[PDB]
Amino acid sequence: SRVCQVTGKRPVTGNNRSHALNATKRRFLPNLHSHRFWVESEKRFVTLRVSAKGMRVIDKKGIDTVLAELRARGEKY
Amino acid sequence: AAKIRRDDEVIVLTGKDKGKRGKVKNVLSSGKVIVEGINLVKKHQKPGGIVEKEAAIQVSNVAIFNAATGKADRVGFRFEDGKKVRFFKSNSETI
Amino acid sequence: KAKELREKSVEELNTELLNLLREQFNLRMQAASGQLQQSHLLKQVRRDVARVKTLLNEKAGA
Amino acid sequence: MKRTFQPSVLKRNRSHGFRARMATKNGRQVLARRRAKGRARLTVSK
Amino acid sequence: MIREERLLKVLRAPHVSEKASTAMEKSNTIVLKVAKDATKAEIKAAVQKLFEVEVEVVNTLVVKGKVKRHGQRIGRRSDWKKAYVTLKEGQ
RNA sequence: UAAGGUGAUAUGAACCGUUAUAACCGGCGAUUUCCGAAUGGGGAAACCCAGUGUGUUUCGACACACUAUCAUUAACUGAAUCCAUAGGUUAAUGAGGCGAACCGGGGGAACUGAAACAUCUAAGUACCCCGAGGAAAAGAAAUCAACCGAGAUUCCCCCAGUAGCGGCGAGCGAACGGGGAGCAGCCCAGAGCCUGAAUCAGUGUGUGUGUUAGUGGAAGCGUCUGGAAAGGCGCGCGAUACAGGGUGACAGCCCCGUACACAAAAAUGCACAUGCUGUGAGCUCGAUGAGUAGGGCGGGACACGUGGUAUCCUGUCUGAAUAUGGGGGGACCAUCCUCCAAGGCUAAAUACUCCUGACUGACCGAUAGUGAACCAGUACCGUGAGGGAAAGGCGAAAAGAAC
RNA sequence: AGGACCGAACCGACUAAUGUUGAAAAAUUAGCGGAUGACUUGUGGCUGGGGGUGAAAGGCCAAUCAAACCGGGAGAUAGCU
RNA sequence: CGAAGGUGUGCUGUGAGGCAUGCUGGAGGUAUCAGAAGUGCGAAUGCUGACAUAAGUAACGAUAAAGCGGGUGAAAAGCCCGCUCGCCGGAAGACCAAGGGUUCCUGUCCAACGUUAAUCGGGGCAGGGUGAGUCGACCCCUAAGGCGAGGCCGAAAGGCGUAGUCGAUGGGAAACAGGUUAAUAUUCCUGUACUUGGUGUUACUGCGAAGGGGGGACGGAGAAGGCUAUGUUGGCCGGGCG
RNA sequence: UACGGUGCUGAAGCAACAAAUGCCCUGCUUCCAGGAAAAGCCUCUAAGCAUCAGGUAACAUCAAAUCGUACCCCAAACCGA
Ligand SMILES: [K+]
Ligand SMILES: [K+]
Ligand SMILES: [K+]
Ligand SMILES: [K+]
Ligand SMILES: [K+]
Ligand SMILES: [K+]
Ligand SMILES: [K+]
Ligand SMILES: [K+]
Ligand SMILES: [K+]
Ligand SMILES: [K+]
Ligand SMILES: [K+]
Ligand SMILES: [K+]
Ligand SMILES: [K+]
Ligand SMILES: [K+]
Ligand SMILES: [K+]
Ligand SMILES: [K+]
Ligand SMILES: [K+]
Ligand SMILES: [K+]
Ligand SMILES: [K+]
Ligand SMILES: [Mg+2]
Ligand SMILES: [Mg+2]
Ligand SMILES: [Mg+2]
Ligand SMILES: [Mg+2]
Ligand SMILES: [Mg+2]
Ligand SMILES: [Mg+2]
Ligand SMILES: [Mg+2]
Ligand SMILES: [Mg+2]
Ligand SMILES: [Mg+2]
Ligand SMILES: [Mg+2]
Ligand SMILES: [Mg+2]
Ligand SMILES: [Mg+2]
Ligand SMILES: [Mg+2]
Ligand SMILES: [Mg+2]
Ligand SMILES: [Mg+2]
Ligand SMILES: [Mg+2]
Ligand SMILES: [Mg+2]
Ligand SMILES: [Mg+2]
Ligand SMILES: [Mg+2]
Ligand SMILES: [Mg+2]
Ligand SMILES: [Mg+2]
Ligand SMILES: [Mg+2]
Ligand SMILES: [Mg+2]
Ligand SMILES: [Mg+2]
Ligand SMILES: [Mg+2]
Ligand SMILES: [Mg+2]
Ligand SMILES: [Mg+2]
Ligand SMILES: [Mg+2]
Ligand SMILES: [Mg+2]
Ligand SMILES: [Mg+2]
Ligand SMILES: [Mg+2]
Ligand SMILES: [Mg+2]
Ligand SMILES: [Mg+2]
Ligand SMILES: [Mg+2]
Ligand SMILES: [Mg+2]
Ligand SMILES: [Mg+2]
Ligand SMILES: [Mg+2]
Ligand SMILES: [Mg+2]
Ligand SMILES: [Mg+2]
Ligand SMILES: [Mg+2]
Ligand SMILES: [Mg+2]
Ligand SMILES: [Mg+2]
Ligand SMILES: [Mg+2]
Ligand SMILES: [Mg+2]
Ligand SMILES: [Mg+2]
Ligand SMILES: [Mg+2]
Ligand SMILES: [Mg+2]
Ligand SMILES: [Mg+2]
Ligand SMILES: [Mg+2]
Ligand SMILES: [Mg+2]
Ligand SMILES: [Mg+2]
Ligand SMILES: [Mg+2]
Ligand SMILES: [Mg+2]
């Protein structure tokens, strides 16, 4: 499913609104990308499906901390 | 426990045979008794003949007959020698 | 007759069980032939089999 | 003239039988409704 | 090796009929009602043990029970198994 | 607990029992086919077909147990590929499915109203989906207030159809503050000191008190009518019992009860008390939740429809200060007041009733009341989902009509 | 050889009469077209409702079709009778 | 010593109504003054049940067709037996699959069912009846297609699909003739066969798969020859002399 | 003979001719539209076992379970009340 493995961001629903304020249901999707992250501690690449926001989280916190969070949530990588 | 039992001498309180005495022959779980010589019906028996027989009477329509007093009585329950006994309410005497 | 059956070993209960099952077979055949007068024997042997099997399982364990 | 009901026990059981009902969540909801109603016959199976 | 307990349950009754009577006269064949899950092997073993006769062969069939009415209430009799047990020539 | 009993239509047959293994009632056990999550594989449910291991065998066979999947953990094994990692195998632990409502969450209509209709309404309703519990959720102020003060959350009555929102239409509709129900506060983000004392759990045994069978339980006769008396008439008696039901018409005293007084071998709830396993009180000294707050864009939520619009949530792009600091006080600024987000737990008052017991009704009484007083979710209809009836009363007693 | 010819089975359905509370909710009788093919038929399978399928008639999708059936929103709404 | 209800009759008030009482009925009823409403029916092509009308009318379901004698019986156009007649005969005969499920056979019954009567029945009731190594299923094998460990995908539900595993309408061992029951028969019996597998013995010997190859294994049309099923005629045998 | 049907006995039992849409034929000829799969079966070896097993042949012996089987089936029994 379209779920960020780092942040848990997923599709949310809302409205399109016309100029006449006609509401039609829409979705807002996360900006997801499959990305190979270098994990220096394992001498390995780990692929995560991550939002652009999740990539900024990884840049800030570091991949090792994030993967530690993933294991503790039962999030498989 | 039952106040009226098989082989008790009873007197009829109610009905066509009011006042008559007889021995209880059967106690039915419906709350009725067959009393010897009481509540006779003429059954037209298919082969065969018209046969007189006892019909069951409501157990509340008979009373234990107290031979000493010569009249209907009520039963109470007491424990004597650790065993439950019946007694006549009239005279407190064990049945 | 549980109390009297209770003072027998497993081996004695197993031979007792076989006797009852053979008796049950013979009565079943007699009832089928139209020759069993005493229909009450059928229930008696059936309940005796149950009693032996109960005690075999007690002497096994629970 | 050829009428609409043309019986086949195999097609009956595959279309509507107990195992067909159990194979999907919506089929299991059919069985739940019919149990709740107290139907003697849950499916065409029996 | 079929246990005696099992053998004591498989034979239910002799089947009494004109066909069964003729089977015994003409072909030395006894007709039995047997347990619905009795196999030919079990029936053979039971007859040999319990009636003390040599069996040649067992043929079997399942009798489907009749639908019956008992005062505007539909009912069905039970299915049961019939065994034609052919005894050997001397028996 | 017992003088009767072997459930019903439903008699009979063959029996069992009467002083205590007849039956009946309750506690604890035993047995518990096959299908069904169904789990050894398969399958058109109630069937078809295996493997493995033991044990029996009369050599024909036979019995019993185990063998699903996923998650977690552990061990062993083990690629491309060096170490490895993926993968594999086995063991242990757990899950799975079902269930009427209530509860939290993910999605989410339209008819309709606006006397048309699109904003708006209906409505975050119906419905679908996920998850939980006996309740759930919420909860210990980055809350309100107004310079006086209050002091977590939840629920009830007010405030008020007010203030507002609104094609300023139809409609939608607060809060502040007040009266009540119920009340309870804590822990981590960390060491040290002294120690493991506290309070919760778990697992034992006392101790009452309940529950799941039961026991005793008062006192009425005569006469009249009548098929029958419980009715009339006459004269008695009980009442901590005149609740109720039955009995040949309407019974306090005929029967079963009722008030009242008692009872448990066994299992089990509860409340205590007292052993035991883990949980570790208190005190000085720190520390104080960042892709976060805030912002731009798009939406949503707030009674509040973008409006002059605070506040909350975030799909997207960004991005602080971090106690000398930060949030809020309905655009915004200053001042003042007040609070401390980005970690978490927490009883009660609140919601509901598939189900169990008791009791009640100016509720129905067979076209009513459940669809169903009755063998009804049946018969019957439909490929199926699904739809879905009609149908109660002899008599006090079968004495159910011998001939 | 052949979407060749005549013609039964088989598949159709041009005309007429009958029938129209039918023998039948589409038939019967006499005639009629195709009949080695773009044929016909058995068994099983797949496509699902604004969807299918359609040598195209809005045809067909269980005697229902310009939006199936069943249950629900639901007592929609009804300035009308 | 007769409640409600039912049904008559009399009296009575301006009305809705009221009162009394005969008969039926056989156990309930309820003044007064207050209180509450599922409180009043002729209509709604209203709803349910009952019963009319048309009417003893139409019709009795292929125009293949009956006639008579005897039997049984309460009763015979319809049943049974017999003779004759007619109808089908690429079917209106026979055997099956599918589907149905006891309708099969025997005895007994005639209420209802059967478009009439019914002694008859696919009707009621009871009893009986289905026999397999070789027929079929199951089973081994796969087609379309289905499901699908992991997997990939998707707000949730779920979608797709790999290994696999299911799935016949197709591929895969073997039995025939005669006889027999009221009712089964390639299943029973008689006679004569065949298949596959497990053991044992004897002898000899390279056996061995989740792999390779072969085979299984395949269209339409047409033509000709060789045959048999089968028929016809003769011969033969038994009977016949109208 | 119980007018249902049993029971005992049994002759000839050959040839010619005609002849399928059935068989040889999953053939042959021909055409284009170019006509399942997988197992059983036969054969080959791999790893492995190796005076073992296994294989093949003959003979003997045992086994072949379970479920269906009545009856209608162009129809009064199925689909059409
Ligand atoms: K609307
Ligand atoms: K309007
Ligand atoms: K009296
Ligand atoms: K009485
Ligand atoms: K009373
Ligand atoms: K932000
Ligand atoms: K401040
Ligand atoms: K009803
Ligand atoms: K539609
Ligand atoms: K009256
Ligand atoms: K009153
Ligand atoms: K009317
Ligand atoms: K008439
Ligand atoms: K007639
Ligand atoms: K077989
Ligand atoms: K099988
Ligand atoms: K002549
Ligand atoms: K058969
Ligand atoms: K058939
Ligand atoms: Mg045989
Ligand atoms: Mg068989
Ligand atoms: Mg399974
Ligand atoms: Mg299984
Ligand atoms: Mg669960
Ligand atoms: Mg409008
Ligand atoms: Mg909570
Ligand atoms: Mg202050
Ligand atoms: Mg008592
Ligand atoms: Mg008393
Ligand atoms: Mg009375
Ligand atoms: Mg903080
Ligand atoms: Mg903020
Ligand atoms: Mg923000
Ligand atoms: Mg802002
Ligand atoms: Mg914004
Ligand atoms: Mg907004
Ligand atoms: Mg502000
Ligand atoms: Mg009703
Ligand atoms: Mg009535
Ligand atoms: Mg042509
Ligand atoms: Mg056409
Ligand atoms: Mg024609
Ligand atoms: Mg032409
Ligand atoms: Mg032609
Ligand atoms: Mg048109
Ligand atoms: Mg149609
Ligand atoms: Mg539409
Ligand atoms: Mg609505
Ligand atoms: Mg309406
Ligand atoms: Mg009314
Ligand atoms: Mg009326
Ligand atoms: Mg009117
Ligand atoms: Mg009429
Ligand atoms: Mg007329
Ligand atoms: Mg006329
Ligand atoms: Mg006429
Ligand atoms: Mg006719
Ligand atoms: Mg005649
Ligand atoms: Mg008659
Ligand atoms: Mg005729
Ligand atoms: Mg004739
Ligand atoms: Mg029948
Ligand atoms: Mg018949
Ligand atoms: Mg008639
Ligand atoms: Mg019949
Ligand atoms: Mg799939
Ligand atoms: Mg398979
Ligand atoms: Mg097949
Ligand atoms: Mg036959
Ligand atoms: Mg020939
Ligand atoms: Mg031809
Ligand atoms: Mg047959």
**Interatomic separation, CA of residue A49 and C1' of nucleotide H213, rounded (Å):** 49
Torsion of CA B61, B66, B69, B70, to 10 degrees: 60
Cα C55 off chain centre by: 12
Distance CA B37, CA B35 (A): 6
How distant, in Å, are the alpha carbons of B20, B21, B24, B27 from that of B36? 10, 9, 6, 12
CA terminus-to-terminus distance, chain E: 24
> Residue C41 Cα, ligand 61 centroid: separation in angstroms?
59
HSE at residue E32, side-chain half, CA atoms within 13 A, is 27
User: In chain E, whose CA is at the least distance from the CA of C23?
Assistant: E8
Nearest chain C CA: its distance from E11 CA (Å): 8
* C27: three-class secondary structure by DSSP: helix
How deeply is A48 buried, as exposed, middle or buried, from its count of CB atoms within 10 A (0-12, 13-18, 19+)?
buried
> Residue A65 Cα, ligand 32 centroid: separation in angstroms?
28
Distance CA E57, CA C22 (A): 24
Q: What is the DSSP letter of B59?
A: G
Backbone angles phi, psi at E24, to 5 degrees: -70, -45
Q: Does E50 touch chain C (CB under 8 A)?
A: yes
Q: Which nucleotide is nearest to D12 (CA to C1')?
A: F383
> Residue A22 Cα, ligand 2 centroid: separation in angstroms?
21
What is the residue extent of each domain of chain D? 1-46
What is the residue extent of each domain of chain B? 1-95
> Residue A10 Cα, ligand 36 centroid: separation in angstroms?
20
Candidates E49, E16, A74, D18; CA nearest to C25 is: E49
Proximal ligand: closest to the CA of E68: 62
Q: Which nucleotide is nearest to E84 (CA to C1')?
A: H131
Long-range own/partner contacts, residues B67-72 (CB < 8 A, 24 or more apart): B67/B9, B68/B93, B71/B11, B72/B11, B72/B13
Residues with CB under 5 A from ligand 4 (ion): B 60-61
Experimental method: cryo-EM
**Interatomic separation, CA of residue B59 and C1' of nucleotide I45, rounded (Å):** 100
Expressed as residue numbers, the domain containing A76 is: 1-77
Distance CA C48, CA E41 (A): 29
Distance CA E34, CA E17 (A): 16
Q: Does E7 touch chain C (CB under 8 A)?
A: no
**Interatomic separation, CA of residue A31 and C1' of nucleotide F8, rounded (Å):** 73
Q: For strand H, which nucleotides have at least one atom less than 7 Å from a protein CB?
A: 98-102, 124-126, 128-132, 147, 153-158, 168, 181-183, 187-189
How distant, in Å, are the alpha carbons of A36, A48, A54 from that of A32? 13, 10, 9
Expressed as residue numbers, the domain containing C24 is: 1-62
Least CB–CB distance from E8: residue in C22, C31, C32: C22
Is there contact between E49 and strand H, defined as CB under 7 Å from any strand atom?
A: no
